[PDB]
Design a protein around this ligand. Structure first.
Ligand SMILES: C[S@@+](CC[C@H](N)C(=O)[O-])C[C@H]1O[C@@H](n2cnc3c(N)ncnc32)[C@H](O)[C@@H]1O
Ligand SMILES: [Mg+2]
Ligand SMILES: [Mg+2]
Lengths: 383, 362, 49
């Protein structure tokens, strides 16, 4: 029997996954610049590889930044500090290939303009999405996936599971049922967890620990039953992880960073980018809008699209899809959005306080669904 | 009025990120020619005067990476320092670790174009193709390889399907030389590029044109913006439509299910629409650890099918075998034709096996 | 009083700086390297660099 049921799955990766190392390093570099120069123009790409971190991209800033220190301190905090773990901050190669921002981009975007008039730093499309299925207005699949990795990191850093290393991958498969445009998560179907580990600890001590200390502490019992499949350390000997024998890049976990397959994505990455890059600021803005609509009671689920042209301040297009979860028309919801939001980057930066150096926080465990971020605090709407 | 806008973008061959995708798949192609069973996971990074290869390779082939990268950059059009990049003089760095011898995928199809793709991205892709073509002709010799495009189309909802009405907005940014002036570029982009790509019935007096909106675009390619493999995955796929699980395509060989099953899911989706069973469809394939066949397949036909989801699933099960091994055999995925996929989108063009609709028997 | 031990590598398309510097100075290495190459006279593909 089936009705209108389906499976959906989302992954998250821990801080030590090579791609997410790059994301966090790029955001550490951005924060370092914003501490001294709030108007810094940053486009930092990081590359992680056996024994190597390379910084490539472009930065115009008044800050004096010691790239060797910021990169190595980041790798330190992530937990790579010895050969035994496959990577050491003290002894890794750090190359830097950073130049100024193209003057052609500067003149065309932000030079000699009032803040509210600065153009989009690029063309692009960005999506925002919210769903009433969790308190945090996010898909349960991605939320559980993130929180599992966060738990592993927690239990690693407070010594309670000292055999854990920084690299990890989780996949949460939830069984869903459609409900008049909304989606009801019914049960957790499958949970996969691969995590990098000590030489000493035996396989089934880890597996016991992943179930009893990680999953039990994270996933409400209401979603777990006797049929739920657990794939804990499925391959077995995952002692080799992180950059060693692997190659990661900034912006190769954009789906993990956002909605875990749900809603939509326009393909712009977040990390290493100041507010003038609308891939970040407009995506943050669009999440804010989507969450505001659902928390404001105007719909149970929603997807928002916005687009920009480089050097132009106002969005080229804005669109709302409520999946038929609102009594009001999508056009009416658009009218409400137009009245309550100003989606130019020069304004978004004020409303969301995006010159603050708090970006490294966002580089793991997802950019959405968390308490402290301005874009997760819904706006009271007037209509 | 039941009307909505949707936007998609695409980029040119000279776009830093697309440069990297093409080189990554050029490395793959070259390996597959000598060794059909080569394992490749090759990332490319691009920046002023630099091409860096990084990744894992288990292959019997001996590849001249120098020649591979340099011929790729040549083909793309970067052949002088005046253009910001030159195949003859760039730095090629190799850091590949070579040796000697699960997932959720989405496929999507819509009947709004012959190629069975969203109009927004099809046009975006074709505008870049046109620029490349007119650059290579000599018709517009001030053009340079790096370019971006973005198309916003006004749609009308029609019982599950989406009906294009008009083009709302068009963006074109293309790197250029230092002689040509701004009015000449804008006239040309409008009259020689757009009007040769977009059907006239979609263009009108209200269509907005942002052409060379930055005002100057001389500095381009890896000099103006670092490039990385796998940073244009929405451009590679459905331009904001359908759905995407996370995996990049280029630099990966056919044994990665992220690539080859995404191709297969597309094949199914297109076959359903071309077979008249749907006007629009999204195909979900869940794979699971320790099973060859998909663990579960869902089919969202948006109410455009007369047949139910269970009926469409049954049709899918007797015409398709979605076990990785069979997919690479059926679609001929061991062959070295991955470089042509690395610009202008992986879906939409008939030349690919997964874009050949299967005649369905039910 | 800067402590400087800078080794430079030069090949097709590349200048690599490798070594050890402890200094209170703010040096833009990109400009400094490019300016020196400009002064040597390598300013076009037709010269090989
Ligand atoms: C504008 S850049 C990204 C932002 C950049 N990293 C920065 O430092 O601001 C992204 C892409 O836009 C295109 N681009 C580069 N320079 C441009 C210009 N002056 N005008 C319009 N588009 C440009 C290129 O295709 C490039 O890869
Ligand atoms: Mg970018
Ligand atoms: Mg990019």
């Amino acid at each position: 029997i089936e009705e209108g049921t389906f499976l959906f799955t989302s992954e998250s990766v821990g801080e030590g996954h090579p791609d997410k190392i790059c994301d966090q390093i790029s955001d550490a570099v951005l924060d370092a610049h914003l501490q001294q120069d709030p108007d810094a123009k940053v486009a930092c790409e990081t590359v992680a590889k056996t024994g190597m971190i390379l910084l490539a991209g472009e930065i115009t800033s008044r800050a004096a930044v010691d790239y060797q220190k910021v990169v190595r301190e980041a790798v330190k905090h992530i937990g790579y500090d010895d050969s035994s773990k496959g990577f050491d901050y003290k002894t890794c190669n750090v190359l830097v290939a950073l130049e100024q921002q193209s003057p052609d981009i500067a003149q065309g975007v932000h030079l000699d303009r009032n803040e509210e008039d600065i153009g989009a730093g690029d063309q692009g499309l960005m999506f925002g999405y919210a769903t009433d299925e969790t308190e945090e207005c996010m898909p349960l699949t991605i939320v559980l996936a993130h929180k599992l990795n966060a738990k592993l990191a927690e239990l690693r850093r407070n010594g309670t599971l000292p055999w854990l290393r920084p690299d990890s991958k989780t996949q949460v498969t939830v069984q869903y049922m459609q409900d008049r445009g909304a989606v009801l998560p019914i049960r957790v179907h499958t949970i996969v967890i691969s995590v990098q580990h000590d030489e000493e600890v035996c396989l089934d001590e880890m597996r016991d620990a992943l179930k009893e200390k990680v999953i039990k502490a994270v996933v409400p019992a209401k979603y777990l039953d006797e049929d739920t499949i657990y794939h804990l350390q499925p391959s077995g000997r995952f002692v080799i992880g992180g950059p060693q024998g692997d190659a990661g890049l900034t912006g190769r976990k954009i789906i993990v960073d956002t909605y875990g397959g749900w809603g939509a994505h326009g393909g712009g990455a977040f990390s290493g980018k100041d507010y003038t890059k609308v891939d970040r600021s407009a995506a943050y803005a669009a999440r804010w809008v989507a969450k505001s609509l659902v928390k404001g009671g105007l719909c149970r689920r929603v997807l928002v699209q916005v687009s920009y042209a480089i050097g132009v301040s106002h969005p080229l297009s804005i669109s709302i899809f409520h999946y038929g979860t609102s009594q009001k028309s999508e056009r009416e919801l658009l009218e409400i959005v137009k009245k309550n939001f100003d989606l130019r980057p020069g304004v978004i930066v004020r409303d969301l306080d995006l010159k603050k150096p708090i970006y490294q926080r966002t580089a793991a465990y997802g950019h959405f669904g968390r308490d402290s971020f301005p874009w997760e605090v819904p706006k009271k709407l007037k209509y």
